[PDB]
Amino acid sequence: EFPTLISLLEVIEPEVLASGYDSTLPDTSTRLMSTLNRLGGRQVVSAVKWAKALPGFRNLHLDDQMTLLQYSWMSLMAFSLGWRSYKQSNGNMLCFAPDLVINEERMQLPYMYDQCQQMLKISSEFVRLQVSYDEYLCMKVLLLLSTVPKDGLKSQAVFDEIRMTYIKELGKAIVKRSQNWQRFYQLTKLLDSMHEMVGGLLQFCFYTFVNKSLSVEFPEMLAEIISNQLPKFKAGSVKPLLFH
Amino acid sequence: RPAILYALLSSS
Ligand SMILES: C[C@@H]1C[C@H]2[C@@H]3CCC4=CC(=O)C=C[C@]4(C)[C@@]3(F)[C@@H](O)C[C@]2(C)[C@@]1(O)C(=O)CO
Structure with missing residues (x-):
């Protein structure tokens, strides 16, 4: 019989991309941020492929698929970054890629320290709660489904049912490992706090994007x-789904 | 609307 949803989430999880960061040239903040954005664009492409393979996702209207990915790309990438940093270094360093770790000479670069601290926060939550792989996979799906327009979606019905599916799945992963309800509480608190941790990252992203002087490069993706997301965030027409 | 994103979703 048919493979479990959880086993499917494992097979569709993208492989970690390499950055090609040349730690041979001198470390500058503009160059590091540019490299990170390049690696970011590639990871997002990877996330579109992943979301497409995601049972249920293709049943949403194309506008809604686009909306969800637009609003949650930053949280998807920050969540995986937290995961890799947890597995690869127990949350001691940011592990962006096998060829790109943030050491103390590049954490001390202008603008870096604060953004890196916010990202390590995410990593250290995984450490605190000792999150399992399966918990992580289900939570990552829920993140894709966590930020919606205040004006609702088109296929709201299909959307509500998709959320139910993956909440079930997180529940099952919790069952198959404190106490079930406490664990669910803690993990959904973690999801809720992602909105705050990531709001700050978005703010800095918008700043490096709009700042002419700084010359940080973004891939076209x-x-x-x-470019599209910025006016919607200013206007405050973006709604976090919170469990609490 | 973000063209590369939309295209990515419409294709492969
Ligand atoms: C502080 C922000 C948050 C950063 C992002 C955090 C999440 C992430 C994880 C990765 O594995 C690769 C790229 C991204 C997706 C990212 F690291 C880069 O894009 C650079 C980024 C936007 C940022 O460093 C900038 O705005 C620099 O311009």
Whole structure:
């Protein structure tokens, strides 16, 4: 019989991309942020493929699929970054890629320290709660489904049912490992706090995107997403789904 | 609307 949803989430999880960061040239903040955005664009492409393979996702209207990915790309990438940093270094360093870790000479670069602290926060929550792989996979799906327009979606019905599916799945992963309800509480608190941790990252992203002087480069993928997303965030027409 | 994103979703 048919493979479990959880086993499917494992097979569709993208492989970690390499950055090609040349730690041979001198470390500058503009160059590091540019490299991170390049790697970001590629990871997002990877996430579109992943979302497409996601049972249920293709049943949403194309506008809604686009909306969800637009609003949650930053949280998807920050969540995986937290995961890799947890597995690869127990949350001691940011592990962006096998060829790109943030050491103390590049954490001390202008603008870096604060953004890196916010990202390590995410990592250290995985450490605190000792999150399992399966918990992580289900939570990552829920993140894709966590930020919606205040004016609702088109296929609201299909959307509500998709959320129910993956909440079930998180529940099952919790069952198959404190106490079930406490664990669910803690993990959905973690999801809720992602909105705050990531709001700050978005703010800095918008700043590096709009700042002419700074000359941080964005690939065209992200540039188009960010460019579109920015007016919606100013206008405050973006709603977090919170469990609490 | 973000063209590369939309295209990515419409295709492969
Ligand atoms: C502080 C922000 C948050 C950053 C992002 C955090 C999440 C992420 C994880 C990765 O594995 C690769 C790229 C991204 C998707 C990212 F690291 C880069 O894009 C650079 C980024 C936007 C940022 O560093 C900038 O705005 C620099 O311009």
